[PDB]
Structure formats: C-alpha cells, structure tokens
Symmetry: D2
Subunit: 318 residues, 4 copies
C-alpha cells in the first residue's frame, strides 16, 4: 500500500488528537520544499537567459518563511538567512517555533553540489509574547525535525517520536512517496567524513581518531573517506551507509563551525531517532542549552559504535 | 542572445562543412542524457511503489539505443559491457564512442551526485569495425564531456573550440548555454581524493597531501572535498579550481579509474579548459591503450596544482 | 495569502470536527488526479516508442482512483463506469464514505487530444448493514462533496461542498493545486448553448424549439454562440466559467438520456447548484432523482439559471 | 527505432543539401513551442499567487519572435499580435519568412479550452530589402507549415513536401517524439464542425450542406457535431478522425473571419499534404493571392469526399 507524506502526517496527527497545527505546518513545509526543489533543479532558467527576449538561497528562505507564516501554526521563525528571529504577525500565530536552514550547502551551489533544507520544530514553551527566546530550547525538546536533500533525486527525511521515515519526491506528480519506513542506522560503518584540510588545526583527539580510521591498530581494513562539503549530503550518506561524520571545533573556530539551532540539533535528532548518536564530545548535541540563535557547536554523529569509539579517544585526551 | 545545446552544436557542425553525423550523434546523446536525468530524479517512482495497484542498466540502454539510432556510430564502448558493441551494418556511422552511462551509481543509494561521461573518436581505419577502433589515445578525441545530475543537471561539452556548459531547464527539456569557453583557475585551494587509502598511498601522494594540510611556507591550508563520484569531483575542480587525484600505488600500479571512458574524457575537458591531467609519468591523453577497460592513474585540475604534484612525484622518482 | 488544495481541505475538515476521513479521501483523490494528469500529458511516452530499445489511459485512471481511494481507509463502496458492479472495500480498509466516479471522462475520443477529465461524487454511507451496491443509490441531494478535474490546456480541480465551489489550478512545477477562484458563482444568464446538434433529427420537440430560439431569437436579440467539445467535463466547465447552457437530453431513441446519473449527472448538477446554477432532467432536479441502478442514465440540462428556466418554459409548453 | 523532431528535421535538412537555415528555424520554433506549452500548463503559477510572499498570448508571441530572430534563419515575421510585419535586424537575417499565430484560441483560454500555435514558412523570393510584401505569397509556396496543439497532451504536427508527421511532447524529457508518420486523412468522415450559432446569417449553400449532415439524402446515419471553438483543436480532430471543418463567409463577413496568412494557409497546407482539402468555396485556400497580411478568408477543410460534397452544394447555389 503506497503512502505519501501528506497521508503519513495526517494519520500521525490524527492519532495525537490535537489541534491539527503540526499537520498544517508540515504540509506547508512540504509544499515549500517542492518549490525549492523545482528552483534548485533550475526550472525556468531559460527565461533568465533570454528565451523570451532572486538568488536561490533568498528564494528558498522566502518560500519557507511565507508557507510557514501562512500555515497559521507558527509564532517564531529562526533562519540561517536572517540575523534576528522572525516574529509571526498576531493574526497568523500558531504554537510552534521553527529553526531552519532554507538551502544548506548553497555556498558551493556553483559546482552543482548537492544542497538541502534542514529544519527543527519545537512547541512554544514560554507564555510570554513570542520572541527569540522561544527558539532557545535544547534539541531534546524537538517534536519533529529532518531535512530535504536535493541530490541525484529529492528526498525528505522526517523524524518524530514514531521514528525516522524517508520520502522520495516524484517529479512527475509532485508527491513525496514513502520509500523507507522506521529507518535505523547501522550499528557500525566503514566510512568517516570530515574536512581533513583542517588537519593542522585539529584537536589531538580528532587527529588520533582519524589516524585509527586510516591505520587500524588492530590491522583491520581502513575506513573509506567521503566529504561532499554539504551537511545534508554527508549526514544522509551516514544515515544510509552508516559510519561517522565530523565537524569538530578548530583552533580558528573554538566553538565548532556548524550552527546548533538549524544544522546540529536537527541532524542529531534524526540520528538518535534512527538509533544513532550525535555528540559535541562533551555532551549530547540535543542536551546543549542554547543562549544565542546562531551559536556554533562541534558535532560528531553517526553509527553508535563509531561515535562511542571516538568518545573513547576523546576521553583519553581529556 | 539565448543559446541551446541543439543550436550550438548545429552551428559548429555547419562550420565544419561535413556530413552532419557528429551533430546527429550529439543530438541523440543529448536526448539520452535528458532521459537519464529524468530517471535519476526518480520521475514515476510512485508507480514502482504501487500508486496504481536498475538505473545503471536503463542508462546504458538509453545511450546505446540513441547512439545506434543516430546512424552516426560504428563502435560503442561502455563501462557496463565486457566487450565493445558493434553497431549493425545498416546503422553504422563513422564515429566511435566510449562512455560511462551512470558514473557514481554504486553509491546511488545515498542520493550522491551521479553522471554520464563520454568521449567521441573518429574511426581511423576502414577495417571492419571492432574493439580495436576504440584503442586510440585521448589525444585523438574530437569531442568529450559529461552530464552531471547534481543539484541541477548540467552538460559540459569540450571540443576544439573550447569548453561550454549547458544547464538543463526541466520546464522545457532544453539545455541552456550558461558558461562559454570556460577556463579553469590557474591555481585552486581544494584537494580531492579518498584519504581512506592513506596507508597504501605512494610516497609522492603522501607528501603532496601533507603539503596541502601543512604548507611549508605557512600559507593557508587547502580545503578537502571528495564526493566519490568522478563527474562530481572533476566538475567542482573545473568550477572552483584545485586538484583531483585517483593515483596508483604498489597494489594498483595502474590506478582504479578507467582510461577510455573516465580518464581520457576528463583529461580532454581539463586541457581544453587550460588545465592538466597526468598519470604522473605522462599526460593522460598520450597514453596508448591496448585494452578497452584498462585502468589509469590520474591527477588533474589547475595547472599550478598539477605542476606542484609533478614536482613532488619527480622528487620520489 | 496563497492556499493549496491540501491546506484548504485540511482546514475545512478541522472545522467539521469529525474523524478526518473525508480529508484523507480528498487528499488521496488529489494524488490520483495528479497521476492521471501526468499520464494524460503523456509523460514517459518516449519509453513506449523505444527510446531505451502500456495499458490504456481509461484503465490506468480507474486503477489510480480505485487504489488511492481504497488506501485512504475512508471508503466502503466504489462505483465507477469500469466495473459493472459496485466495488466493496475489504473490511480492513473500510471508511464511512461512498464514492461514485468517472475515472477518465471523454476518453472515447482521446486520440484527438480532446480535453478529458475525472468526475467524482462523495456520499456518507447511510445504512448500518454490510456495505453493498445499495449504498450508492442515494439521490444527488445527499452529496457531501463533488467535483471534477479537467485535463485541458491546464489541469484544474473544481471542488464543490456546502461552503461553495472552489477552483484549484495544478502547478506542474511543484505538483500543487493552487486555489485561484474562491466561492465561484455562475452568471445569471449566458450567451452560449452546448449540445450535439447531430441528433437534431431525433430531438424532442421542446429541445428543437429551444435551440431554434437560441439561433433565431423571438425578440431579434443577438443569437447565442454554439460550442460542443464532446467531453462533458470540458463543456460543463466552460458553462461554469462563461455561463450559458449545456444539454444532453432524452428522446425517442434514448428516453432516459445517455449520460450516467451516479458519476456524470449528479456530480455536475451538484457543482452547478452550489454555484447558483441549475440542472434538470426536464421533469425534476437531477439531484432529486432516486436511483435504482448504479449505471442508470439520466437526461440533463444545466447551466445559468435564466437559461435553464427558459428551457423549462419551452419544455412545459410541450408537456 | 525511436525518432525525435530534432533528429527528423536534421535528417530531412541534410537531404536537401542547403544552408541548414530551415533546420535552425524549426529547431528554434520547437524550443519556443515547448516554452509556450510549459506556460500554458501553468508551470510556476504558484509564484503568481504568492507562494513566496504578462499575458500568455503576449509571452507566446515574445517566445516565437525571439527564438525565430535568434535562429538567424528569418527576415520577415508576421504575427496575429502585431499590426505590422516585423523586420529582422540585418545582423540576424536569414532567407525565410514566417507567418504565425502564437496562441490560437487564447481568447477563451480562461475555460481551459485547448489552444495552439500555428505557423507557415516561406522562402523569401525577392532580392530587395525585407518588407511586409515578402509575406504576401500564396499558400502554394509554403516550404513548411503546421501547428502545436496544447490539448490533453501537447503535439506538434509538421507538414512539408515529404508529408505530414506528428510528434508528441514528452514532458519528462522535453522531447517531441514521432508517433505518427506520413499521416493521411480519411477519405470520408462522420463529423461536421462549425459554429451553428451563426445559422441565421448562414449562406444558403452552408445551410443546405449542414441540413444534409443532419438529415441524410441517402438515408445514411447523420453526422455527429463537434465545435471546440479553437481552430487548432477542431482542425486536429478533423485530421485524426476525418470529417469536415467550416468557418465560412456569411452576410456580414463576406471574407470570413479566420486569417489567411497564419490560420487558413497553414491548416490548408497540412490538409493537402495529408491528402485532404481546403477551399474558400471559390478556390483552394492555398491559391489565394494575399494583398494584406491580416486579411480574412473563408475556409472549409477536411476529408476530400466531405469537402467535395460541400463544393457540390456550393455550386448548386452559384
Ligand atoms: N508525539 C508526536 O510525535 C506528535 C504530537 C502531537 C502532534 O500534533 C499535535 P497538534 O499540533 O495537532 O496540536 C503530532 C505529533 C506527530 C505529528 S505528525 C502531525 N501532527 C503530529
Ligand atoms: N573541428 C571540430 O571541432 C569539428 C569537426 C567536425 C565536425 O563534424 C564533422 P561531420 O560529422 O559533420 O562530418 C564537428 C566539429 C565540431 C562539431 S559540433 C557538431 N559537429 C562538429
Ligand atoms: N459539512 C461539510 O461540508 C463537511 C462535513 C464533514 C466533513 O468531514 C467529516 P469527517 O470525515 O472528518 O468525519 C467535512 C465537511 C467538508 C470537509 S472538507 C474535509 N472534510 C470535510
Ligand atoms: N524539400 C523540402 O521540403 C526542403 C527543402 C529545403 C530545406 O532546407 C533548405 P535550407 O534552409 O537548409 O537551405 C528543407 C526541406 C525540408 C527540410 S527540414 C529542414 N530543412 C528542410
């Protein structure tokens, strides 16, 4: 029996016996993702080049912002594109807070590298008028999170209490088809992923861990390396094939490089619901209590056995 | 003035004052690429999952059938077939095509970028068409390039007139020229290779990479990128500059990538863009093949970067 | 503020405070319509012609609607022209709704690329017994929702319910039905008449006179223009958009008409009335006919109120 | 062996051993048709209705005009949209003259009625400077003509000396696939098509002919009636199923309503190449010598036996 994102979300929402807001929020997000996908694949670019005689990152942010506002299900929206949190006007306010990266990896979009949209949804905790503070909740409080990967094909990965589910976008009918149910990551993988160009500035624990991947002390087979440079692409591969992904702090970026609210937490949430792990090295990414919407956070995630191994090394140097 | 792949190819073909075969060959290849793109993006997958109650193989079938039906080819070598395919007499043309229908499909499960690579040669002898016709050095290529099915689909075509990039507009199924006579940066800031092979690296590769991470002159270290799909990594190299490596080692003296449909085409694109592509010992394009599926080591990209690698290579030779 | 079919239906369903079944039913129908549209526009036809080295569209369309409706868990009885008998949903997937539909209206002459469409009518099961064909034998007056999808120059879904008639345009770039016309109302009177005049010889006297009045106005006013696509969804939609009248009447040859009551007449009659229009068999409102056979035919004259009323005047003159 | 419009045209052009201009002209027209089709099917309409926060007839004209000019194959362009003939600038001039209707039937497009693009291509016959006069050639001089129908699906019908060929647009790959080769219309059909709302003003010959279709003299079954209201739709159905199409002259319109250069001649050309007929009642549409680029012309076309029958009636009243 075929299942669609719309059908799947509607059913889960029905079981929750709530107001239906999260359902509308996700439906709206889904529509925005399809619009972003269409623009990313360059539909209509011919008109830009004069067949008849805005930047993608900006368009993507506009699509998400507008669809979420018009869903009547949100009150505070934090985007990687905007310096300040966006406060939804009173007549369209809902009880949810959304932190998102409209188009992850767009910086190197020129090379047609895979790009994506990352999102994390929280239920407003405070009763105060909506403000940026409502987005400062630990990832542990997420009600839903995931991402859309615009790679060889477009896929939406949605994680919630019921687990992780993957939907493939069928461009013929503009429908997200459920192709992988209640996904779980491999206990242990054979791929490590990180920008080794930072080698010179790596912390000792990262240096040793990577060394163990290339020169297994037990003389087992060395791990293969992959690093697309786009978090959504690297994380998704990690989910599908297992292994480990790292974007640790650098000497130059003492608090890591990736952002906690819309890059780390969402992926950490997907990973844990898939039976995986995500740590800053000191604690679970999901337990970090944010003080700034754009603060950075180090992150090491993936197969449990792989992350545990890294933590062992980390502890040795602590 | 907008330009399309069809219009561009037709015009160049007209200037050559030939039979029009290469034009038809490229038109057919273009159509196949759009079909592969459509399937790669998973159009119609809903029917596979029961809404009404392999990609590598499909891609090879699309290229094979379109090329044969173009009446412009006589010998077809594919990464998917053990032996060279000989076009039936009634559909034979003067060209030989070596191609990889869907490069990087091995990891297609993670939705990693994939692509199609191709190299076109003019048959050199009047001998009945055979596998030998595809054993020409890349230096003899008349046209070569690839289609990248990434965030968007792009077709990169290299010929004597240079390198031109066309973006596929899915709304009208038309390849739009967006970058003309492309040239790669003299020097980049990104190195690309599977460092998981570190333990088995050749001494020259180990030192070169060490210089990218720990520049002896204390300059900024290079960033690392390795998609795992040749078309994706090579295209990034072309767009941003830098270097790409899939070298040889004691255990793989000739490398892992294939000369005919992976190395030669990319080497050709690189040189036409003012870049370089070496096996370490000689230019990839000068290697004279003896086997259609033979492997070849390859280091390509910005000239200053490749030259630097060669300096290190020489140091260990 | 943009609105989509999914958002619109979800909201209306929420206001009804029910089980959410009709919402799932409509979502599923929507998905099927997009799939039908894709196939109708011939996506992938290249594969059929050997680009890489097959079932009829009416059959595929029926399969799409049937499968999506069954999988919605919101239906129990499905009537289509395809199957002679009503389809009874298996117990484990039964919902409280009954759906009567025409998977691909006008497919008979589809080779000419004439506009085609999907027509549907949704009823709430009334009986307490086991689902059967009988549950589809309700007068159109009992419809909870009805409409059609027109696969013409563009694809549009017209949905009629108590709240009125709303038109959604399918944006192929994102596979989303965009609301472009809200609470639509048909013009009080139009200037176009639509029917197959090839049946002239067998026309009922009332139809003959009425048409005569459209071509040769009694008060020498401007004669009406004629349009007849041959596809009910196309002709009816034009009638809704431009106003006027559509006829597929009965006669000596066809005493009960040619179009089907359950999945052709009732749905269009429902859309017409919700839009402030009319739909009569000549004797009574189409919506009031109590069916005794799921495939029974019914004569139908619908469109602008003033035009239908005028027809009825002529009809009465011959009665 | 699959064939595409691009492949088909390139091959025919090669056999002509010319400059390649008509090939480029057709390729360019093909691209324009795909762009028009995309817009007609309303791709991107979501952006018009605010998903992120120019009329079709005008856009269509712009697409055809721009693509034809940029083909470097034309010198004079006549469109139903522009009062005066468009003269291609010197640096982009080619030897062909094109008369076209960018979007036929767009007047009633609000009802989603089928619409289409009609075109007729002539070779400039003069040696002087390009002018409106170069478009005043009888249809008999056409080198190529046809139309694109944007109906349930999009199809391009191309007629040339080699015959009539039909190509279906596959939206998945934006390719026109040849599905019907060297098409021939039925000797006799069973459908008549005309706006009977003009009955009161019908010419006596038209009145009698239609009367014969409804009340047959040989007691054969009456013809069925069909009238979409869009010439491309009605003419295509006539081609596919056979029969007859009429848009005759009456009391008020002695010269008919449809335009000779970009509506009548192209369809007349398609019909004759398909073994059909097209008459004004007095002579073959293709033999009319135009004196005004926008002049009207009566037209009766379709299956030969049907047109011949009409002509018999016409002669009876002459
Ligand atoms: N525990 C959960 O995962 C949970 C809790 C409350 C919910 O809805 C609450 P509402 O906003 O309707 O008040 C929803 C979920 C999963 C989904 S999917 C669509 N809605 C929900
Ligand atoms: N020098 C060149 O780059 C060259 C030589 C011969 C050619 O065709 C010869 P034909 O097959 O028509 O005999 C073509 C080219 C560039 C292009 S683009 C389309 N055709 C050609
Ligand atoms: N009066 C109405 O128009 C009405 C009554 C009950 C309904 O749902 C009942 P449910 O199946 O949820 O129990 C719905 C409607 C309009 C829409 S749109 C989606 N659902 C409904
Ligand atoms: N006999 C014909 O129908 C004829 C004559 C000359 C032609 O090309 C003349 P050119 O512009 O290349 O000089 C072409 C055709 C059919 C086609 S299809 C593409 N080109 C042609």
């Amino acid at each position: 029996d075929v299942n669609t994102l719309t059908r799947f979300v509607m059913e889960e929402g029905r079981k929750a016996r709530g107001t239906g807001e999260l359902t509308q929020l996700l439906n709206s997000l889904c529509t925005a993702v399809k619009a972003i996908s269409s623009a990313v694949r360059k539909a209509g670019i011919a008109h830009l080049y004069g067949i008849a005689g805005k930047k993608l990152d900006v368009l993507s942010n506009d699509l998400v912002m507008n669809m979420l506002k018009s869903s009547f299900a949100t009150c505070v929206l934090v985007s990687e594109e905007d310096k300040h949190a966006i406060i939804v006007e009173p007549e369209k306010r809902g009880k949810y807070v959304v932190c998102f990266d409209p188009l992850d990896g767009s910086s190197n979009i020129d090379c047609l590298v895979s790009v994506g949209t990352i999102f994390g949804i929280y239920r407003k905790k405070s009763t105060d008028e909506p403000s940026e503070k409502d987005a400062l909740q630990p990832g542990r409080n997420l009600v839903a999170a995931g991402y859309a990967l615009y790679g060889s094909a477009t896929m939406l990965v949605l994680a919630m209490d019921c687990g992780v589910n993957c939907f493939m976008l069928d461009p013929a009918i503009g429908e997200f088809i459920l192709v992988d149910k209640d996904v779980k990551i491999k206990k242990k993988g054979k791929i490590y992923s990180l920008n080794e160009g930072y080698a010179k500035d790596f912390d000792p624990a990262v240096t040793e861990y990577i060394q163990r991947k290339k020169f297994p002390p037990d003389n087992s087979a060395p791990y293969g390396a992959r690093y697309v440079g786009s978090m959504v692409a690297d994380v998704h591969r990690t989910l599908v094939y297992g292994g480990i992904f790292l974007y640790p702090a650098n000497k130059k970026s003492p608090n890591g490089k990736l952002r906690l609210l819309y890059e780390c937490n969402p992926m950490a949430y997907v990973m844990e619901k898939a039976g995986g792990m995500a740590t800053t090295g000191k604690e679970a990414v999901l337990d970090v209590i944010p003080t700034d919407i754009h603060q950075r956070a180090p992150v090491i995630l993936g197969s449990p056995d792989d992350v545990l191994e890294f933590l062992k090394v980390y502890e040795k140097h602590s």
